[PDB]
Design a protein around this ligand. Sequence first.
Ligand code: CLA
Ligand SMILES: CC1=C(/C=C/C(C)=C/C=C/C(C)=C/C=C/C=C(C)/C=C/C=C(C)/C=C/C2=C(C)CCCC2(C)C)C(C)(C)CCC1
Ligand SMILES: CC1=C(/C=C/C(C)=C/C=C/C(C)=C/C=C/C=C(C)/C=C/C=C(C)/C=C/C2=C(C)CCCC2(C)C)C(C)(C)CCC1
Lengths: 55, 55, 35, 478, 37, 76, 41, 41, 31, 28, 341, 120, 65
Amino acid sequence: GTFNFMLVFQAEHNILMHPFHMAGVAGVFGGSLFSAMHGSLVTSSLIRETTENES
Amino acid sequence: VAGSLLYGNNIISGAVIPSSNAIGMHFYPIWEAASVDEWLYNGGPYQLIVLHFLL
Amino acid sequence: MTTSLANFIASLTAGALVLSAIGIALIIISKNDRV
Amino acid sequence: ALPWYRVHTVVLNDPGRLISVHLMHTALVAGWAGSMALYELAVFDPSDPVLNPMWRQGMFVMPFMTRLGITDSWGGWSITGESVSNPGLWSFEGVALSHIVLSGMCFLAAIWHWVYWDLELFRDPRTGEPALDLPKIFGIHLLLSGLLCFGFGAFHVTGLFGPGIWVSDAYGITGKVQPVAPSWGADGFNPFNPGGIAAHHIAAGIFGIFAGIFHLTVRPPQRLYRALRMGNIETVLSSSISAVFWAAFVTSGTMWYGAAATPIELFGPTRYQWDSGYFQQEIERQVESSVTEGLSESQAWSRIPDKLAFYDYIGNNPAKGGLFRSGPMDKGDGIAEAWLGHPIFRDKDGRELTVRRMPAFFETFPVILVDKDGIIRADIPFRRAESKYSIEQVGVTVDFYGGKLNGQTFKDAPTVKKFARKAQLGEVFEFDRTSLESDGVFRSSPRGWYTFGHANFALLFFLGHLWHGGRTIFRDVF
Amino acid sequence: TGPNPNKQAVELNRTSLYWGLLLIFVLAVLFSSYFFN
Amino acid sequence: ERPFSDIITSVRYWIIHTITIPSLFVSGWLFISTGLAYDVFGTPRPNEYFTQDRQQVPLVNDRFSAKQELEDLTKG
Amino acid sequence: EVQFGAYLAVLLGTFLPVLFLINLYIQTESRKAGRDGGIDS
Amino acid sequence: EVQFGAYLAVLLGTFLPVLFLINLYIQTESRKAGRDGGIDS
Amino acid sequence: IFTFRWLAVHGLAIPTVFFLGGITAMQFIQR
Amino acid sequence: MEALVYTFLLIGTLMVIFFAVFFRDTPR
Amino acid sequence: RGLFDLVDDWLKRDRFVFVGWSGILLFPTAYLAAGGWFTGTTFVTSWYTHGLASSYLEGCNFLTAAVSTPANSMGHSLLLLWGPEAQGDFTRWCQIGGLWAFIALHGAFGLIGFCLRQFEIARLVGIRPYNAIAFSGPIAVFVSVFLLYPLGQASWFFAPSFGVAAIFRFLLFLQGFHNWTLNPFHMMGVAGILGGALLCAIHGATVENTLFEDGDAANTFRAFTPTQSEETYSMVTANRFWSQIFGVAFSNKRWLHFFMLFVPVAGLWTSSIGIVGLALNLRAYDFVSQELRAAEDPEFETFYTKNILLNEGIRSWMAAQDQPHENFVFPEEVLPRGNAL
Amino acid sequence: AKSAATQSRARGIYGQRIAALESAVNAGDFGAVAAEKNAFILFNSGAIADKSKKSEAVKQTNAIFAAIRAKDAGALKSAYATYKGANDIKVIVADKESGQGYSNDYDFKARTTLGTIYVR
Amino acid sequence: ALRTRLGEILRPLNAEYGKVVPGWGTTPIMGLTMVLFLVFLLIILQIYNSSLIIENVDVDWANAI
Ligand code: CLA
Ligand SMILES: CC1=C(/C=C/C(C)=C/C=C/C(C)=C/C=C/C=C(C)/C=C/C=C(C)/C=C/C2=C(C)CCCC2(C)C)C(C)(C)CCC1
Ligand SMILES: CC1=C(/C=C/C(C)=C/C=C/C(C)=C/C=C/C=C(C)/C=C/C=C(C)/C=C/C2=C(C)CCCC2(C)C)C(C)(C)CCC1
């Protein structure tokens, strides 16, 4: 049903050319990018307190 | 249009159909129908679900 | 020895030239400012 | 103490049990090969090798068996069509039983090499700790690989001591297994020239022998030894993973585009042959040659073999199936039985019309008839209110030459429309749609499933290169 | 032959068990419709 | 060293920039105005999309004979 | 209508890993109980 | 020819109790190993 | 003169000005 | 007959969620 | 010592920007790719390959300019400037569509160089290289689509073009011809992307709303020494809040960040598999049972059949102009259509 | 990708161009005849999907142009006639009752004598 | 550690763990060989891609024998 909704909406209103939809797409893409960057940076900088045989 | 599992739908294709186009934006509670069968024929559950969910 | 072979070998020569130019720049600048 | 994704690291510093676990993977692989061959042999129908080949019944490991020489069965039939009297040991069943017995023996050997783990061979003489001199093991196993490579090409593919490989003609009508002589010129690098296989494997074997002899007798440089961490076992894993996914990409490409190592009679035609019109142009050339010789249209079209016409049908296109449509190609259309002939459409003035063929990239295509220049002359309308090019209005007739419907003509609109609908998929055949309860949707040939699987595997193994190699380089931080 | 000094133990707490159960059930729910075709 | 906040103040920077930048800007303007770009890159002019003889879209239709095809489509 | 092999695929591929994970958790808990001296060994 | 539900019946009724028994044995062994202070807890 | 920073900033700021001049010239072309 | 399979899978997922929420390892 | 040691010392100094050994691969390729895109969206046209105008010189704006794929007659040619198609002559090379191949081929090596640079810097500062895998995600996406999809199809012509509206065309094209929204791999990709956005927003809000009072001004930004030992916010309060609101909450600070790293990369890697599958026309297009029942019973209807009809409309009304080299001619009486409009 | 559509396009355009030379070659327009060398080459290269036929067409075109470079009004006419007979080249004009040469733009028959369109 | 007959036969082949040659050495040969391999791979790839055409080589389905 959501696919039907999206297809009809694009046909009738020409979304993908509205700047607000572009803002939303940038929001989700940038959110994923920043989440990955933050996770990588924080996890890489862990101090050694376990040795090998322990998560 | 069929949308339930018991009427020949899978998880991907099943849905809860919106209300009828003849109703429009009119309020359609259960007690305003002549019978429960008529309520189910005109897409009654959609309004109930969406309203209680938004609240 | 068609035109394709000649152009292929010429492209190899051009790539070697570009790599040599880059390497020469790196070597010269590294030797200048030793430290 | 170990999490669930680190359990199999207990054999990292145990050379005795690493052999055991690698033997276990070997035994499982051999058992799978044997059992798959046995299961395939019990659902194969060898009656008709013309209109029901192996690639239309979903056979996957049988083409690889018959590519290198196996053609006979203990049941008295052969893959080319023949009555064999004494097949021998190396038949379709002996190979399966051999791989099975090998699986069992490898299982027992794995159990032994696991129980007796403490051997003096795996211990360093001066320190007493377990060790493995990888730069020399590499040389030994590489010399073995080179020797194996030279013999396959000099004795099995050339015929000196062996049957050879499968070689066909340009259009896949007459194929057989015969020895192949090496070609040493520039045409040996032609992918479609079967003579390059022998030359390649011979020269690669010689170079592998020499490379093994070198990498056996020269110690590694110290700088490279430190840079590449040659004292660690994980760098070997990373390099091997890289090589493996490179090879997988190469094999996937050669299977999709076609080569001499993937013959058409064993895996099926390619999508580019349908795109360009290979078989259609060959059929036209043969028919014109026959006509110029002084033959009628009916005779010329009756001299066309059914096998050649079967390749010109869109149901054999590997790029026409679906991901979740499972089973053999016979599950979609049924089993082909006979050819119906070539239809020729003529309008009221006698000029010839051609139905526009369905591209492999569409799923539904309109029915359009065009003349020799591309101008439309008839079609099947969607809206029957102001149509001008309907078949009823134009009055098109159809005649059949060759095949089952030779010499018959039709003039009423409904039958002409039915044949026009049928003619946009290529040649028309008669199918048996009840034996397997066919549904009616096309499926994919073994040429597509192999590509899908091994390409996805290579893409996944690239991440293995990255992760396992990074763990090699950053050992002291991990 | 003898006692191997490389023997260790495996571990799985309750949070990981719940995560695995959820993953398996959700994957089955997602792919069942396509498997049935 | 000397971070940007010092460059954006030194007067020699200002004079060299005031003498250099307009030359480049005018060079770009003249590159467009003189019609050289249409020749360098092959972009058709607003009155060269259709010729008097060709009234259809000129799609390239060959691989190894693209030079002759493009020469014919362009003017010939 | 539907393919019959899907029943076997779905049910087996759902049931086996679930029991595998449950076994992992239960053996971990049993080892933990065994390590700490108590009424349950 | 044959009944289709028999596939599911036979396969499920074979696979479930076997895994239950293996679970019981493995947890017993883990508890025994945990009780004795060793390299594996 | 030959420092890395100068070569960078420049080799990405000269074409920018050239292209901006080109676009400004384009803005006045008439059909 | 596959509606039974769909319903079973959905109810099993809901049961897993219930057990995860109410029978959980103490954060301490 | 030797020249190698001197070059190694010079390459790993502390200057404006790190160069390293990977800089040799990274800088020229990325610079050339960016310059090619900028010079293609400004001067080069697409009249001879697609029949479109795609430059500022012709009249397009930022939303419609693009660098278009080469002509279909060149199937999978590498399109080298010295190759047998252009034979030098820069103008013909631009006109046939060589800039697309130039940009793609240089950009792939640019991406490889950036990944190697991440490895090198992580090794230099002595930390785990967790950023390399996270970037390997997008590398997989780019490789998969932009290279593997055209290579399985007829030609380079069916690849995405480097433009804003061209990407929208690509999206609608794949929906119309492949039913890409029904594939169970774009579904996992969507789940991963949306979950990543959710995690970013929720972690930011939670951390910012549990700060310890370490200042006297309402401007809480200037109450953080560049780096100290004490934690900024309260983990216990956050755990209590999220366990009493949602029912479950994080308690380990390393698992949180690993989850944040893991989710979107997994989404991208799952979607790449589906794209690789589409490259061979191994679509997930139809549900056979519903099609059979609808064929035999002209009263069965779901949303799936509606989407199928929409796809048919897209194909029929788009193919004629979307593939100009096929000379498709469709009379008005043949185009599928509904009532009235 | 080479296919039947490529042959159709090349055949249409270049066969029309070649057939336009009938009146010119009837009397003799050596320069105007040589002005279509590119058209002859393009028709030979991209409108015949047959090795032997392509070789024969190349040989015939070479003979035509060799006769052109001789001020030979007879050999040129004979070679042109045999080329037309072999390759089946003729001028084609269509109508609307049985028409629809083209529907949209991008077609090689948009504004040519082959282009007819029927609008309901 | 148990000693077997095969162990004594194969003992010399695993006895030099860690032995190296001090400082570079055969590295330039390795570099030259890698460069030649790259050239060979490029040649065969461009032959298969039809970007390099040579006489008497036709990249198409062959009649063979
Ligand atoms: C004496 C040993 C032996 C023999 C003769 C066979 C014979 C056969 N096997 Mg079997 N097999 C064996 C052992 C053996 N097997 C073992 C031990 C295993 C378990 C690992 C298997 C697992 C197995 C499977 C899974 C399958 C077979 C199949 C087959 C058949 C086709 C083989 C084929 O196409 O290979 C083709 C082999 C290759 C293309 C390998 C290429 C080698 C790569 C490229 C090496 C490159 C790296 C190298 C180091 C390069 C450097 C060296 C160089 C410089 C010189 C054939 C009847 C197939 C079959 O028909 O099914 C029944 C099949 O599917 N076998
Ligand atoms: C002991 C012994 C014996 C016996 C043996 C045997 C009996 C064996 C068998 C074996 C076998 C019988 C084996 C089997 C195997 C199999 C396998 C190993 C499989 C695997 C599979 C897989 C892995 C798959 C997966 C998948 C799926 C499921 C889905 C899709 C995807 C994939 C494909 C991934 C003998 C008497 C001889 C001798 C003495 C000893
Ligand atoms: C291709 C090629 C090449 C290269 C080239 C190059 C390298 C170039 C460069 C170029 C460049 C490098 C250019 C640039 C340009 C730029 C520009 C043009 C920019 C613009 C900008 C703007 C316009 C901005 C805007 C905005 C924004 C973004 C935001 C806010 C708002 C505003 C509006 C301000 C060579 C030579 C090798 C040769 C071969 C080919």
